[PDB]
Design a protein around this nucleic acid. Structure first.
Length: 183
DNA sequence: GCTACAAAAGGGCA
DNA sequence: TGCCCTTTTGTAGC
């Protein structure tokens, strides 16, 4: 499962669910204290809960985005809790088509990387402009995943909709990272 | 408290 | 149109 002997830690999960009902945002924004709303700035009511620590963007259309959870299950859990809060408020809220939209992971290979060398050998995948951003942007094709590689050996993997995509991207990159270990 | 990246949802505006 | 808007999170040099 994990040949490199390293398991990326899941850091942020983004999901969406359909409450399947139109919502009155100003009413929700008035009844709730755990809520914010400035339509002039953004179309959603921003709401937050402590456990699991997350932030939901709630729309009039009944759709909802959930951010900040550390796992897929935590994300679904937080979404149901927001859905329960909306119900207590007077809306016939359901929970339709809950879907994990993005998973962000990170790990430490515990060795320095020669980013310049890596980018040169993988030009068709690499974006390295150190004066702009200190990390090398690696757009992997299979799985379709974006990895941010730093000189420190710190790696961020984002864009996954399944956690096995996150693990594979990392196992795919590990041998390349070793090839460009900074001695 | 910006550079960079992924992703969703919506109003607004070239 | 599509591209911002907003939110989250890791990373790191400015």
């Amino acid at each position: 499962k994990h040949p490199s002997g390293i398991v990326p830690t899941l850091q942020n999960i983004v999901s969406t669910v359909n409450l399947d009902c139109k919502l009155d945002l100003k009413a929700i924004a008035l009844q709730a204290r755990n809520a914010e709303y400035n339509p002039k700035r953004f179309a959603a009511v921003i709401m937050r809960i402590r456990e699991p620590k997350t932030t939901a963007l709630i729309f009039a259309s009944g759709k909802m985005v959930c951010t900040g959870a550390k796992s897929e299950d935590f994300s679904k859990m937080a979404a149901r809790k927001y859905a329960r809060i909306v119900q207590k408020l007077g809306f016939p809220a359901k929970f339709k088509d809950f879907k994990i939209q993005n998973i962000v992971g990170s790990c430490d290979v515990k060795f320095p990387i020669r980013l310049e060398g890596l980018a040169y050998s993988h030009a068709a995948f690499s974006s390295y402009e150190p004066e702009l951003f200190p990390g090398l942007i690696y757009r992997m094709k299979v799985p379709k995943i974006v990895l941010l590689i730093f000189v420190s050996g710190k790696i961020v993997i984002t864009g996954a909709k399944m956690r096995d995509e996150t693990y594979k991207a990392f196992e795919n990159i590990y041998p390349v990272l070793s090839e460009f270990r900074k001695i």
